[PDB]
Design a protein around this nucleic acid. Structure first.
Lengths: 100, 151, 206, 50
RNA sequence: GGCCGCAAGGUUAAAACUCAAAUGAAUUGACGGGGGCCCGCACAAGCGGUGGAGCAUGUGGUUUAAUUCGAUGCAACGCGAAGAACCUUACCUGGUCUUGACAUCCACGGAAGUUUUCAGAGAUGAGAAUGUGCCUUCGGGAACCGUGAGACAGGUGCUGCAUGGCUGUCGUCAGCUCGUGUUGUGAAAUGUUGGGUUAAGUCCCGCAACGAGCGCAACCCUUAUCCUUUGUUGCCAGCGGUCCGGCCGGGAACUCAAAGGAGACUGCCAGUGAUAAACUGGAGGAAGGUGGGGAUGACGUCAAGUCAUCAUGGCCCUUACGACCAGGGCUACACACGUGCUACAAUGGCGCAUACAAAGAGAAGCGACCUCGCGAGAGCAAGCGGACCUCAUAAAGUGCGUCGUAGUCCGGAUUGGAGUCUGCAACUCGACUCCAUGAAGUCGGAAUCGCUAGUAAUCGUGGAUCAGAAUGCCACGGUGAAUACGU
């Protein structure tokens, strides 16, 4: 992966960590029933002025050694190729070839 | 196969009566692994057939089979560049198997309402020497007769 | 055809692991990354001290690293100053207390990683590949391995068409799961591209 | 196991987690202190519930 | 040209020009509509499908501002993609920057929370608050921010016909080779062929051969029968309380959990065979002759696939083939092909009520009981990092009713109205719920595919990727066949 894509991911994580609480408060206002019926409108108009990259759904999981956007596994933080290389070298405790 | 010997599989007998013939008939009638449906159909058919003849279900069944068993058939050979029909004898297990298959195939094509009724009618016709199964036996024997020169 | 990895297929039968710790789903990936960075740092820093194996353990809330080497004097230095510098940098990388230990390799000619490294080093100085391979085989068999195999692949000697060559002595049974087989690889960077090297050493059944 | 298209040709791996439970019925202060002041191998996880 | 012949022709017999070879005998392979022997769902004996209909999904073509790049007979076409509304994204249109979005160096000044105006946003400007730690011998500036200049950074740009690594295939086929000796002027041969036997270059015997290596088999995982250790969160024959329920006191027997062990070797018996190797049958035994299923891929072949995972020789671009942003495209639509799902019905459709599983996942997660709504759901709130709590109600089945062969009480494409939830945001382009509508289609031309047993066929259940988005992929159990005369 190019060197700019990884930078994009780092920036996204930073902003999403910065604006976490404000979004939760505004979303609680919008969702909660028996509100003022005008505070709802104002919160809806306010939520869309925050930076777009603060929504956690703009993030994409990547391999931590190459940056690959496909074939990701969550337990290991790597893609299939690197998982296999490490496993055969013996660098993942408890893992081995299985049969049954 | 080429270098194999195949043994026989054990088949349980019928629960109501005690015959393996009837179990094989149920097996040939079943579809998609649903054996209870086939058992129900066969028992209904035999019950309705026993009243029409005043004899036992097994006896009626055997009477129906004895008019459908074949004796000789034809195989295909091609060694001189042409297809020839060669008559051969049929052994007993194959006689029974072919008779059962023809009876079920004939029944499925009838136009009565339920499968039990169709099977009962087909068995009665077979006992009286009528129907598609008996016509099939006749055709096979005719073809085997028209080729005795190649035995 | 293609062949299965010897070390991988033998894990848990006659070969041990290179990492030993227990973790859950929320620390597994972070631990793997920290191990990667530690090994990268040490491998860069000790490029001339004949390292062959880096074992890592994580007891409680600390990290302990064991280094297998053929030049323990060069690794330690004058009354441990070099080991201390390594310890401080590793502790900074990991984020927890660190401890470092040293183990000696008695016979460097029977170690698969070091043989491949020596062949690659010779190839980068314009030696003849047949000479290098034959010398490796002769040394290992003289010091008493039950068998050895060497393989080399690439643009050998500067040819335009690539090629693969190999040599073998003794026994190397790769289908027997109780055979103790050592295996490792290395790469060379020349003026014509990359050249690849593989080594197998056999030592007996268990 | 291939960097490009070959949809068969897979590998399958496994991890096994073993588990054990021990109970102490009638403790004493020295016993509990001794248990708390102990260290075991560096690949096992121990959880104590009082 | 001469001689001879009735003719057909015979006999004697040149040159110009052109090529760098033409030829004989033997050797190792490959091939034969040559011969001999042996194997495999290769035929034969059977069971169920694809090719016709509608829908899902990949490809060719055509269209477009763009419809991003790669895979191509078997061995590409539900393939890289284990999950394209923004992001991902590599493509198009327009708006922007030039030591740079991502690093190391030099030196001119200081950091991080909030909040107002103009932009589609990138990015421009105005303002309020703050004075960090720390040998300050004053030089610490490390931690992390602005600008300036230049060594430099940056490239999913080309060549898999320059390469490393990884993978497909012949093929889980039984083969492929070397040292010393001997034979031939030599290329080479023998061993490795021969008589039997085997799943097997597996084994015995013979023989100018004597030995060894890589493959075959065995050592690894799982499944089937026993016994000795420990018994909670798992288990109740015997005993005794009762609000009926393993609920409670208890018990260590059994089911089960998981560590050590036992067992299968042609070991025993008869017959055949070369005074053999082996073969056909029998006893006991949970299991018999490789008991069933996996992992395991020889020397080599196809300049086979991948410079877009990554790494890398040689070229090529640096106010641009390198950054940043909003909107669109990868979802187009006269057509042709591959892989699938649902059907065309009484071995069935609909209503009521009632048995019997295995294997998994879970803290920004799995979400019980109760209340509200026809429903998708909403509100309030226990428990669980788990043999304890939750996802979670198996379905086909069985019993009692109705439909009575009709394009139907079969099928469920399309299309109109009204809603729910995830998410800044569902127009292009999500999934799901209610009312209404109710298309093709009555078993599919020439071709053509899978399967030898707990298999085919049929029925449900779980996971990875993942805010949301499976008829695909990877696993789990229930019911349970037909046939193999033979080459």
């Amino acid at each position: 992966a190019k060197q700019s894509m990884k930078a994009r991911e780092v920036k996204r994580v930073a902003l999403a960590d910065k604006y976490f609480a404000k979004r939760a408060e505004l979303k609680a206002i919008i969702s909660d029933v028996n509100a003022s019926d005008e505070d709802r409108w104002n919160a809806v108009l306010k939520l869309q002025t925050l930076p777009r990259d603060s929504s956690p759904s703009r993030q994409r999981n990547r391999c931590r050694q190459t940056g690959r956007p496909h074939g990701f596994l969550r337990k290991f933080g790597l893609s299939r190729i690197k998982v296999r290389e490490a496993a055969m070298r013996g660098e993942i405790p408890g893992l081995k070839k299985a049969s049954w | 196969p080429r270098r194999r010997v195949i043994g026989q599989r054990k088949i349980l007998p019928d629960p109501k009566f005690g015959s393996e013939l009837l179990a094989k008939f149920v097996n040939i009638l079943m579809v998609d692994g649903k054996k209870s449906t086939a058992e129900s159909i066969v028992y209904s058919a035999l019950e309705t057939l026993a009243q029409r003849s005043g004899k036992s279900e097994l006896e009626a069944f055997e009477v129906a089979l004895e008019n459908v068993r074949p004796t000789v058939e034809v195989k295909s050979r091609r060694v001189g560049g042409s297809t020839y029909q060669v008559p051969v004898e049929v052994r007993p297990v194959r006689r029974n198997a072919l008779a059962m298959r023809w009876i079920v195939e004939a029944a499925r094509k009838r136009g009565d309402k339920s499968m039990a009724l169709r099977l009962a009618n087909e068995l009665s016709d077979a006992a009286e020497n009528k129907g598609t199964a008996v016509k099939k036996r006749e055709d096979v024997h005719r073809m085997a007769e028209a080729n005795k020169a190649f035995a | 055809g293609q062949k299965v990895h010897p070390n991988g297929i033998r894990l848990g039968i006659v070969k041990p692991w290179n990492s030993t710790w227990f973790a859950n789903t929320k620390e597994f990936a972070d631990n793997l990354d920290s191990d990667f960075k530690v090994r990268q740092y040490l491998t860069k820093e000790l490029a001339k001290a004949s390292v062959s194996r880096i074992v890592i353990e994580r007891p409680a809330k600390s990290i302990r690293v064991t280094i297998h080497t053929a030049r323990p004097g060069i690794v330690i230095g004058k009354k441990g100053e070099d080991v201390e510098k390594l310890r401080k940098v590793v502790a900074d990388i990991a984020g927890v207390p660190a401890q470092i230990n040293i183990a000696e390799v008695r016979k460097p000619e029977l170690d698969a990683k070091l043989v491949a490294d020596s062949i690659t080093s010779q190839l980068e100085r314009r030696v003849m590949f047949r000479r290098a391979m034959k010398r490796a085989v002769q040394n290992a068999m003289r010091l008493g391995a039950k068998g050895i195999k060497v393989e080399v692949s690439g643009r050998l000697g500067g040819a335009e068409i690539a090629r693969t060559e190999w040599y073998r002595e003794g026994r190397v049974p790769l289908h027997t799961l109780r055979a103790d087989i050592d295996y490792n690889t290395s790469e060379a960077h020349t003026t014509y591209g990359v050249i690849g090297v593989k080594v197998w050493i056999f030592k007996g059944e268990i | 196991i291939s960097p490009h298209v070959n949809k068969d040709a897979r590998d399958q791996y496994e991890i096994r987690t073993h588990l054990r439970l021990v109970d102490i019925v009638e403790p004493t202060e020295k016993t509990v202190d001794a248990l708390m002041r102990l260290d075991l191998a560096a690949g096992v996880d121990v959880q104590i519930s009082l």
